Amino acid sequence: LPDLKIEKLEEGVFVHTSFEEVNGWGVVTKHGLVVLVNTDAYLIDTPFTATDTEKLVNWFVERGYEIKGTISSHFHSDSTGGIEWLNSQSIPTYASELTNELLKKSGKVQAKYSFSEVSYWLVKNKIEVFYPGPGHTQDNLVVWLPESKILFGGCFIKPHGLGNLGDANLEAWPKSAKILMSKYGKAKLVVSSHSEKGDASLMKRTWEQALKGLKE
Numbered sequence: 001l002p003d004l005k006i007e008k009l010e011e012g013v014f015v016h017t018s019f020e021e022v023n024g025w026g027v028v029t030k031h032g033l034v035v036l037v038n039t040d041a042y043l044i045d046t047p048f049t050a051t052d053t054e055k056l057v058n059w060f061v062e063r064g065y066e067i068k069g070t071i072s073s074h075f076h077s078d079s080t081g082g083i084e085w086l087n088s089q090s091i092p093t094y095a096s097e098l099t100n101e102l103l104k105k106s107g108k109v110q111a112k113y114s115f116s117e118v119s120y121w122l123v124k125n126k127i128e129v130f131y132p133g134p135g136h137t138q139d140n141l142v143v144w145l146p147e148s149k150i151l152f153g154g155c156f157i158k159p160h161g162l163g164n165l166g167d168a169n170l171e172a173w174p175k176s177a178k179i180l181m182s183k184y185g186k187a188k189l190v191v192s193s194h195s196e197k198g199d200a201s202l203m204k205r206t207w208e209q210a211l212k213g214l215k216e
């Protein structure tokens, strides 16, 4: 029931938070990002709903910013919910090829654009996209802001319990978390889908929870 929130983290980085009841887990709080590169604005994951997605886009346009693209970090609706409404607005939506396949196979609107990298610049020297391996899902990826050393980990960062296991890969998640820890050990801030922002140790905690959950 709470409203969409938009808070500023540092210059150029905003967390958007949206809320949705999902059967069993109760009310889910979902964090995403909005990254500004001069007057360009990029959505890192969409809010749950078209409504909130529209509200978030209007909030930044009305302040003089151009929405230039969006990328979903994985296929579940807490990252993809607003894709359809953005397509109907010719706002470019991005997802990996696997994520669009998983959106396909389960009957949901796909992002307009597919890519197949494991690491690349979404915006050169500004926003990096990285796939550490399967974890929370087979397609989950992260986004890295080298200039603020902030990392968006999505639903892969689980410092207090792994969450929905339905599409997760328990065997791989520890190794993926180790790879993530080595890549981004220099992070100063780690934003996740559902936990409070923290420092680089959230990645260690995630590895521990991935390990505990494999063991059962």
Ligand SMILES: C[C@@H]1[C@H]([C@H](C(=O)O)[C@@H](C)O)N=C(C(=O)O)[C@H]1S[C@@H]1CN[C@H](C(=O)N(C)C)C1
Pocket (backbone or CB within 6 Å): 022, 025, 028, 029, 076, 077, 078, 079, 136, 155, 158, 160, 161, 162, 163, 164, 165, 193, 194
């Ligand atoms: C229902 C959510 C959502 C779902 C998912 O991606 O699996 C879907 C609605 O988008 N993402 C989710 C996830 O585990 O990452 C789920 S579970 C819920 C999220 N915050 C809670 C949590 O993280 N705990 C450690 C208890 C539980």
Ligand SMILES: [Zn+2]
Pocket (backbone or CB within 6 Å): 074, 076, 136, 137, 155
């Ligand atoms: Zn998910």
Ligand SMILES: [Zn+2]
Pocket (backbone or CB within 6 Å): 076, 078, 155, 193, 194
């Ligand atoms: Zn989630």
